[PDB]
Amino acid sequence: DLVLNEYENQVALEVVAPEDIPVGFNDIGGLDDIIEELKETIIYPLTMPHLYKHGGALLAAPSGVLLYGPPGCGKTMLAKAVAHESGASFINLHISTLTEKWYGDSNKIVRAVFSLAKKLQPSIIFIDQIDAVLGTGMVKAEFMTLWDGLTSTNASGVPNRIVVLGATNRINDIDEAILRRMPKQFPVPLPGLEQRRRILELVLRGTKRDPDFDLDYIARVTAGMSGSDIKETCRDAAMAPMREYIRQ
Amino acid sequence: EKNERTRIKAQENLRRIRRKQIDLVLNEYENQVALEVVAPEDIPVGFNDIGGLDDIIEELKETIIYPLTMPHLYKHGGALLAAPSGVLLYGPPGCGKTMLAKAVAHESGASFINLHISTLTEKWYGDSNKIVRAVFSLAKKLQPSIIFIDQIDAVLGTRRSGEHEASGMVKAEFMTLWDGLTSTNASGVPNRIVVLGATNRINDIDEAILRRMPKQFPVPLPGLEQRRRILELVLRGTKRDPDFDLDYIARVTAGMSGSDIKETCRDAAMAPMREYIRQ
Amino acid sequence: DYEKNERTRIKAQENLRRIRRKQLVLNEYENQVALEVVAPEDIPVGFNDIGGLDDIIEELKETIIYPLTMPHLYKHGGALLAAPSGVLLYGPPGCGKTMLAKAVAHESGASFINLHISTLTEKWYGDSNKIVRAVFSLAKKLQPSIIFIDQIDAVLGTRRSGEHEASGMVKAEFMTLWDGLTSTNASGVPNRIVVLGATNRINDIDEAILRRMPKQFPVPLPGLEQRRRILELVLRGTKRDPDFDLDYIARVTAGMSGSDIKETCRDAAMAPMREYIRQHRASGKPLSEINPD
Amino acid sequence: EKNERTRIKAQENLRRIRRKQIDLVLNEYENQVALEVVAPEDIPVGFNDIGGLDDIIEELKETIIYPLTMPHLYKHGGALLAAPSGVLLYGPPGCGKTMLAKAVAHESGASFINLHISTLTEKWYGDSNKIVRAVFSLAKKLQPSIIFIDQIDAVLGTRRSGEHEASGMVKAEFMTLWDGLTSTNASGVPNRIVVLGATNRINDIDEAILRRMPKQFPVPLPGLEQRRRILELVLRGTKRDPDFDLDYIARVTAGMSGSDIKETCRDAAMAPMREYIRQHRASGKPLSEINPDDVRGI
Amino acid sequence: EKNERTRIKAQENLRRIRRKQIDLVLNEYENQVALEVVAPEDIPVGFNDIGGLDDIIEELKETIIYPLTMPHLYKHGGALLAAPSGVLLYGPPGCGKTMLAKAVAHESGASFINLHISTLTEKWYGDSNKIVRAVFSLAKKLQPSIIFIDQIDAVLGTRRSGEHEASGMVKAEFMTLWDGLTSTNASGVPNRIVVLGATNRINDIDEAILRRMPKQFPVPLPGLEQRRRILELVLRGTKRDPDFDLDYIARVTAGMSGSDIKETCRDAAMAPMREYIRQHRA
Amino acid sequence: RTRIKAQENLRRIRRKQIDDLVLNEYENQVALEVVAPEDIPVGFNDIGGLDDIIEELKETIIYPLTAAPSGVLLYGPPGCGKTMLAKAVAHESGASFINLHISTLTEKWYGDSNKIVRAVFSLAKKLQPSIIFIDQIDAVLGTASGMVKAEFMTLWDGVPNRIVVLGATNRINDIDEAILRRMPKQFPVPLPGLEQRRRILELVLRGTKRDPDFDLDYIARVTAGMSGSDIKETCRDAAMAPMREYIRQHRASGKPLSEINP
Ligand SMILES: Nc1ncnc2c1ncn2[C@@H]1O[C@H](COP(=O)(O)OP(=O)(O)OP(=O)(O)O)[C@@H](O)[C@H]1O
Ligand SMILES: Nc1ncnc2c1ncn2[C@@H]1O[C@H](COP(=O)(O)OP(=O)(O)OP(=O)(O)O)[C@@H](O)[C@H]1O
Ligand SMILES: Nc1ncnc2c1ncn2[C@@H]1O[C@H](COP(=O)(O)OP(=O)(O)OP(=O)(O)O)[C@@H](O)[C@H]1O
Ligand SMILES: Nc1ncnc2c1ncn2[C@@H]1O[C@H](COP(=O)(O)OP(=O)(O)OP(=O)(O)O)[C@@H](O)[C@H]1O
Ligand SMILES: Nc1ncnc2c1ncn2[C@@H]1O[C@H](COP(=O)(O)OP(=O)(O)OP(=O)(O)O)[C@@H](O)[C@H]1O
Ligand SMILES: [Mg+2]
Ligand SMILES: [Mg+2]
Ligand SMILES: [Mg+2]
Ligand SMILES: [Mg+2]
Ligand SMILES: [Mg+2]
């Protein structure tokens, strides 16, 4: 919905609009201090800075949020929520898109993604499964150049008010030169015995649960699985009383 | 095709009109590296804004900048007192090796240009070498020419036998333009152009480029005095509570490289701000 | 697609006129290399600005640069007594490899041309090979000529059995149009062309190209003796103390190449200028010291 | 465009007038390839100038030049006793290969042609395939003709999936014209055209093309006899016999190629000239006489 | 551009007349794709001189080359029982597939056209495609016909991103005029055209063109029974000297290509001709 | 040019009459391609047992042309019935089905490469309804060529005139991402299923007698892998078996005169 340089556009297809996102904060599972710190520091000053611009040149938003934990949707719901809550175009990266066909295609794509994130909207960049930047090669040094360099600060002295979330299952092998520029790092433990109660309450909104017992033992039934199979078991025990109801 | 060329020419012409006076012709390739000429009044951080490190602020000025800009003082020595043909800033990530580049581009008028790694890598066979040539030719036509390459250990590197061809002959044209046959002038003038580059590890940049960058300034972690300077410098416009003292934060901060200091200080600046939301 | 043609042709014509007046009809592609002929007046350094390479300079001059200029003196063994196909200046980086090229292009007398490796590689298919033949055609027209390709190891190389196509052809074109079916003449004169190249990585150029340039001069680091003359060559203009032991400087380094010595001399000469500028004196002044460190 | 093509056509017409002597009609494509017809008076190295390898010369002559040129003696044989499709001269770099093609151009008198690989690859699209068809449309208009492609490892070679798509056609147009549908005549003559290809990397030469050139002559480095013969041949023009002992130099040179023996002869042949110049530099101006002497090389 | 145009038109008129006679006016633009119309008599090889290959040589003669030539005896069927449009002839190099193409052009009966790769690739923009239209329109003007693209792996090929879009347009033009919207007639005849192919490798020709030509006959390496006949069928005029045990060379060759078996035979055939070196002696 | 305009007049008259207006010569060349309705042999029933995608066609694209969206892309892999579906559409459309023949677009002149596309759009708008079917649109509309590509979708957005364009590319995710979303509907043409393969077999085996081989029910059990064209090729190879055997038996003697027995 703006002027096109074409190379970056090979990225505009991934630019999710800030509206019509399924975020709906009440639906997310039990996560209090994580959402608290995000809504206080990453998205609160990311918009309406006039309630926040009392101190200039230092109250920008921290350009990097690292979400590390077990494999699951815990590192996805908050990321999708940040964009819809900040009036933010969720410009996903789609890491496999950075694969090399031309000699400098990945380099130009990494340039265009930051160019669009600076020009299009200050919303966020999302790098899921961060392993392209390990720490052991052109694109790796291309990130840290465009991230915080000569063109990062504007004439007013404030940064480009852009955030780049960090999604990865691994830690402490993430190219520490890049880990340095992801200030706010959040350990998100997907397995939760109390958050699972809230997530099951969210799931059972439309599901009929008259005969089955009150939602207590569900908080310990799949105690082993953290967040994924619980999302898959939403229909496991759901249709179980539903086969006989559909046939007759 | 032609429309894109004319549009890039309009960009370069406007950029030269805005940069020259605080217009010259160009070919197809330096017409693209001409979009990297950084205006000095754009980066709002100079030598007065970097803290802790002062000798590097001292060595970058009299040994490099003054020999480059207004060298008429350095005319007593004809060819030997010219400016150092290259500079490199190496150290652990977190210090201000890229922040020094901002100060050099802001508080030293030298026709600063920074070529990104994307400007060098090109799809078509041979365009990368021509881009390097265009860079070193614009650096001559426009020649205080403090060229910058951030993370120079990536576009350059210790070449192996099985290195990619397109990256193995752009390291060669780069060197051939840097101190090649046509480097000096007719009267012996060394053609003042400094290639300032940052890097986290001077271990695989090259064995023939490290000789080219003699002024290699290591940027170590700030000490007990440098941390105090950085704290007193980054809290200029922030709230000043009468109770806390900076020496406590500086003494407790053992490591915490300058970027880490800035981060842990920005995080501390949320104590009074969050309380206003409780209304 | 024509104005660039006119610009390149006028530049090539002016450059060739300059080289000719120092003492003619080119096609579309010979103009691309015609604007790279380096004139002797342009290069300021001669052979007298190289220290310690007096032994290598003799074998690089009397054997390849003066069977090639005035070959009338070498008329008895006209077949054998010709300029070799090329010199390979190989060695660790920072010692005379490009200084010797400068000296040859200045005080050679031959139609020197700097190749500017970007000129070899063109985006269009079948264009690098056209330039590779145009450069040798221009060298034959500029006979005698001394082609120079700094850092041979980039454009050339062991040809990587599965690798790029155009770069494989542009590298297989030197092999064809430099000692090929039409290198010699009707009498035996091999075109009086020498392709001199300076690379800091020997045994990576080619197995079939190291047979082409037979004269390969190793350029090592200076020793205890010729550093004493490299220091003298570098410190030729700076007014000095009546006594500073250059024996100490030449004997203490012991492991630094030519550029590493030039940098030390630069710092030692920058010391007094900085010490004088520290006195907040705006205008120039012709007096200072040279005291060693 | 016409102003340049007219001069081109005039130049190739002059070249063909010089070559054909003891007025063809040419289109634009195989016209510019007429600049490469190498006259026999332009290569002063016959088969009496290469020594050592003789079976390669013998088999080369009596299996190509006698079949290719002078076919009337091979007429009654049929289709078998005819010139082979092509020839591959392979081996280490710097021994005999390019110097065998020189003798075939000077000695065969069979309308030799030097391909000049760059002329194949044209910048425009579908202009390299036209030149590939043109080199065979001109090889047969002045048959017999020997098509020489020096260093057949880049323009040809193992076809891959990730080709340029512009060299894959020149790599396929060539083999479609050189052993294709309309090569043989109405009677069954295979065009009397030979493609001699010299290279040093045989295992990357488009193996489907290796079926085209059957006569593959290995050109190895010289031995105890070939080294001495190359020494005798390269040192012809030199007053070298005060106490010359070439039997010793032939054994000293262990395994260097034929061209390295030549460079050694060069370095050992101009040493006395350097000595004479250094002795005469004391006084006078160089007016060198015929009195140096060759004694011992390195 | 007209005098050379007149030369092209005159030469193509002569060629088309000599092919047809063993009347039609062109548009001067398909006037150069008709220059590859191979004559019937200028191909010295036929079907009776192909030893070894017998299943392929019969499948061509029965199911491809002869639903087309003399098709009136297939009128009992409808859309089926027609000549299948497309042949591949894939196999290793030098095993005798261009020889099969020669034999088909010599003893087929349809107007064989030896369409090269250059005649399809034109320098000007949007002109190579119209040359494709000219090729298929010429095949449709007289429609007993067998188009032949030798080595179909470069002019065709698996299309990638970019890769000279004006070239992928040519493949799209091929497979659009192949069986597009105007392939059949009002009755249902499949245009009466068959395109013969040839290629050392079928792995990247296409996924669409790979099925455009249904019959993909593999020509393998000659075995014992095939080499034992090729080695005897290559020796037509060579005077067989006495005591020549043919069975020895047939087995000692040990699975050699179809052309290398020709070279090994030419060597022995020219051995005595070269031994006739007495004339030099005298 | 006069011959071109004359042939165009004849073809457009034979199309329209089943009232003609002469127009510009540069707009006169594309009008040499107005295919007649009785020229195509195939009908809807000739297509196999798909009868769902063809249902969507007959329910949405042909009703407004008797509004209809602009842009109908075919999706199936090679050999599934894309060109067959487009042929049935051209035969029973009722509009004036005008193809392209992509070479008609690409002219080797500066001011003709887009004049021809403007001519195509002007002819489609002059007589209504119409269809601008482009065989394998992944070639003329890809990722002067730029002028044509831009010229196309600029004239794309032009009662909304009742023009509908239909593309029949055989490849997805490599085709005209700009104009891809601009055309609303895209119809995936999958491979034949059980009932689908049964319909293909029962429709192809129409002229030949009912005993070419064992039976048709058994043959439609192993055709799950092959596409819609390979099944036709296997069917025709099977049909050639009786004719092959009869001709081989007749080769012994007599003149090969046609007979009505396998
Ligand atoms: N000495 C200092 N004084 C003031 N601020 C500093 C200092 N050192 C670091 N900083 C702060 O930390 C950040 C330094 O980022 P910089 O561009 O130097 O990273 P970098 O050195 O390029 O990282 P890398 O070495 O991994 O490339 C800046 O935002 C700056 O405000
Ligand atoms: N023998 C010498 N005498 C005088 N100066 C020297 C000598 N060797 C090196 N230098 C100095 O080094 C610089 C030139 O370096 P040079 O071009 O020889 O390096 P190089 O061998 O080309 O390295 P590379 O091949 O990696 O480019 C000059 O500024 C010159 O003053
Ligand atoms: N048999 C020989 N007799 C005399 N001189 C020879 C012989 N073989 C090689 N030479 C010498 O070698 C040089 C030519 O080498 P040649 O052309 O054979 O190498 P090449 O095969 O072209 O190598 P490449 O193809 O790898 O470049 C000449 O200078 C010639 O004097
Ligand atoms: N059945 C055969 N009878 C006689 N000669 C054969 C036969 N098969 C192959 N040959 C020989 O093979 C040679 C070339 O065969 P052909 O041209 O048909 O293969 P090809 O099409 O060139 O293969 P490719 O093009 O894949 O390399 C001919 O000279 C011919 O003598
Ligand atoms: N459902 C079906 N019913 C009847 N015939 C079918 C069916 N599907 C495919 N066919 C057969 O497929 C053949 C036509 O193939 P088609 O034209 O659909 O390929 P295409 O997809 O257009 O090719 P491309 O993928 O290259 O565009 C016809 O002979 C037709 O009989
Ligand atoms: Mg940095
Ligand atoms: Mg150098
Ligand atoms: Mg050679
Ligand atoms: Mg063949
Ligand atoms: Mg189709």
PDB file of all heavy atoms in Angstrom, chain F residues 48 61 92 134 144 161 168 174 177 201 255:
ATOM      1  N   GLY F  48     -14.456 -35.723 -19.038  1.00  0.00           N
ATOM      2  CA  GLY F  48     -14.798 -36.834 -18.174  1.00  0.00           C
ATOM      3  C   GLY F  48     -15.711 -36.465 -17.022  1.00  0.00           C
ATOM      4  O   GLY F  48     -16.462 -35.488 -17.098  1.00  0.00           O
ATOM      5  N   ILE F  61     -19.289 -18.243 -14.629  1.00  0.00           N
ATOM      6  CA  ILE F  61     -18.614 -17.524 -15.704  1.00  0.00           C
ATOM      7  C   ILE F  61     -19.493 -17.353 -16.941  1.00  0.00           C
ATOM      8  O   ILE F  61     -19.375 -16.346 -17.645  1.00  0.00           O
ATOM      9  CB  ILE F  61     -17.299 -18.236 -16.064  1.00  0.00           C
ATOM     10  CG1 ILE F  61     -16.338 -18.206 -14.876  1.00  0.00           C
ATOM     11  CG2 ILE F  61     -16.665 -17.599 -17.292  1.00  0.00           C
ATOM     12  CD1 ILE F  61     -15.134 -19.101 -15.043  1.00  0.00           C
ATOM     13  N   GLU F  92     -19.037 -23.931 -26.133  1.00  0.00           N
ATOM     14  CA  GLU F  92     -20.367 -23.608 -25.624  1.00  0.00           C
ATOM     15  C   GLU F  92     -20.390 -22.324 -24.799  1.00  0.00           C
ATOM     16  O   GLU F  92     -21.130 -22.230 -23.817  1.00  0.00           O
ATOM     17  CB  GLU F  92     -20.940 -24.747 -24.783  1.00  0.00           C
ATOM     18  CG  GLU F  92     -21.311 -26.013 -25.525  1.00  0.00           C
ATOM     19  CD  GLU F  92     -20.180 -27.010 -25.579  1.00  0.00           C
ATOM     20  OE1 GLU F  92     -19.103 -26.723 -25.018  1.00  0.00           O
ATOM     21  OE2 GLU F  92     -20.379 -28.094 -26.164  1.00  0.00           O
ATOM     22  N   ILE F 134      -5.736 -17.116 -22.606  1.00  0.00           N
ATOM     23  CA  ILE F 134      -4.306 -17.028 -22.880  1.00  0.00           C
ATOM     24  C   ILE F 134      -3.698 -18.359 -22.462  1.00  0.00           C
ATOM     25  O   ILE F 134      -3.515 -18.616 -21.267  1.00  0.00           O
ATOM     26  CB  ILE F 134      -3.638 -15.867 -22.137  1.00  0.00           C
ATOM     27  CG1 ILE F 134      -4.257 -14.537 -22.558  1.00  0.00           C
ATOM     28  CG2 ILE F 134      -2.140 -15.862 -22.395  1.00  0.00           C
ATOM     29  CD1 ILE F 134      -3.839 -13.375 -21.695  1.00  0.00           C
ATOM     30  N   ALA F 144      10.612  -4.205 -23.490  1.00  0.00           N
ATOM     31  CA  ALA F 144       9.244  -4.311 -23.983  1.00  0.00           C
ATOM     32  C   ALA F 144       8.341  -5.281 -23.231  1.00  0.00           C
ATOM     33  O   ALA F 144       7.124  -5.097 -23.180  1.00  0.00           O
ATOM     34  CB  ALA F 144       9.075  -4.482 -25.483  1.00  0.00           C
ATOM     35  N   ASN F 161     -18.873  -4.187 -18.829  1.00  0.00           N
ATOM     36  CA  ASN F 161     -18.410  -4.529 -20.173  1.00  0.00           C
ATOM     37  C   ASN F 161     -18.432  -6.028 -20.469  1.00  0.00           C
ATOM     38  O   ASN F 161     -18.231  -6.436 -21.616  1.00  0.00           O
ATOM     39  CB  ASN F 161     -17.000  -3.975 -20.397  1.00  0.00           C
ATOM     40  CG  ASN F 161     -16.946  -2.463 -20.320  1.00  0.00           C
ATOM     41  OD1 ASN F 161     -16.314  -1.898 -19.428  1.00  0.00           O
ATOM     42  ND2 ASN F 161     -17.613  -1.799 -21.256  1.00  0.00           N
ATOM     43  N   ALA F 168      -4.767 -20.599 -18.444  1.00  0.00           N
ATOM     44  CA  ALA F 168      -4.675 -22.050 -18.332  1.00  0.00           C
ATOM     45  C   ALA F 168      -3.238 -22.482 -18.079  1.00  0.00           C
ATOM     46  O   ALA F 168      -2.715 -23.397 -18.718  1.00  0.00           O
ATOM     47  CB  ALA F 168      -5.225 -22.729 -19.582  1.00  0.00           C
ATOM     48  N   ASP F 174       4.841 -19.736  -9.423  1.00  0.00           N
ATOM     49  CA  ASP F 174       5.909 -19.269 -10.292  1.00  0.00           C
ATOM     50  C   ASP F 174       5.348 -18.351 -11.370  1.00  0.00           C
ATOM     51  O   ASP F 174       6.023 -18.095 -12.374  1.00  0.00           O
ATOM     52  CB  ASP F 174       6.648 -20.464 -10.913  1.00  0.00           C
ATOM     53  CG  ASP F 174       7.966 -20.075 -11.557  1.00  0.00           C
ATOM     54  OD1 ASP F 174       8.941 -19.828 -10.817  1.00  0.00           O
ATOM     55  OD2 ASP F 174       8.025 -20.013 -12.802  1.00  0.00           O
ATOM     56  N   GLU F 177       2.612 -13.034  -9.976  1.00  0.00           N
ATOM     57  CA  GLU F 177       2.087 -12.759  -8.639  1.00  0.00           C
ATOM     58  C   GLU F 177       1.337 -11.432  -8.580  1.00  0.00           C
ATOM     59  O   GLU F 177       0.440 -11.265  -7.746  1.00  0.00           O
ATOM     60  CB  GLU F 177       3.226 -12.779  -7.618  1.00  0.00           C
ATOM     61  CG  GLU F 177       2.781 -12.802  -6.156  1.00  0.00           C
ATOM     62  CD  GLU F 177       2.541 -11.418  -5.583  1.00  0.00           C
ATOM     63  OE1 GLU F 177       3.191 -10.459  -6.049  1.00  0.00           O
ATOM     64  OE2 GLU F 177       1.704 -11.290  -4.665  1.00  0.00           O
ATOM     65  N   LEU F 201     -12.164 -43.463 -18.892  1.00  0.00           N
ATOM     66  CA  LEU F 201     -12.107 -44.697 -19.667  1.00  0.00           C
ATOM     67  C   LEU F 201     -13.373 -44.909 -20.488  1.00  0.00           C
ATOM     68  O   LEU F 201     -13.289 -45.196 -21.690  1.00  0.00           O
ATOM     69  CB  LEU F 201     -11.857 -45.895 -18.751  1.00  0.00           C
ATOM     70  CG  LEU F 201     -10.392 -46.222 -18.462  1.00  0.00           C
ATOM     71  CD1 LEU F 201      -9.685 -46.624 -19.744  1.00  0.00           C
ATOM     72  CD2 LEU F 201      -9.691 -45.043 -17.814  1.00  0.00           C
ATOM     73  N   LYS F 255      -4.076 -57.463 -50.693  1.00  0.00           N
ATOM     74  CA  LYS F 255      -3.970 -56.010 -50.619  1.00  0.00           C
ATOM     75  C   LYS F 255      -4.597 -55.506 -49.323  1.00  0.00           C
ATOM     76  O   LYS F 255      -5.694 -55.938 -48.956  1.00  0.00           O
ATOM     77  CB  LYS F 255      -4.666 -55.358 -51.810  1.00  0.00           C
ATOM     78  CG  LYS F 255      -4.601 -53.838 -51.823  1.00  0.00           C
ATOM     79  CD  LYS F 255      -3.189 -53.342 -52.090  1.00  0.00           C
ATOM     80  CE  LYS F 255      -3.160 -51.831 -52.245  1.00  0.00           C
ATOM     81  NZ  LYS F 255      -3.517 -51.137 -50.977  1.00  0.00           N
TER      82      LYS F 255
END
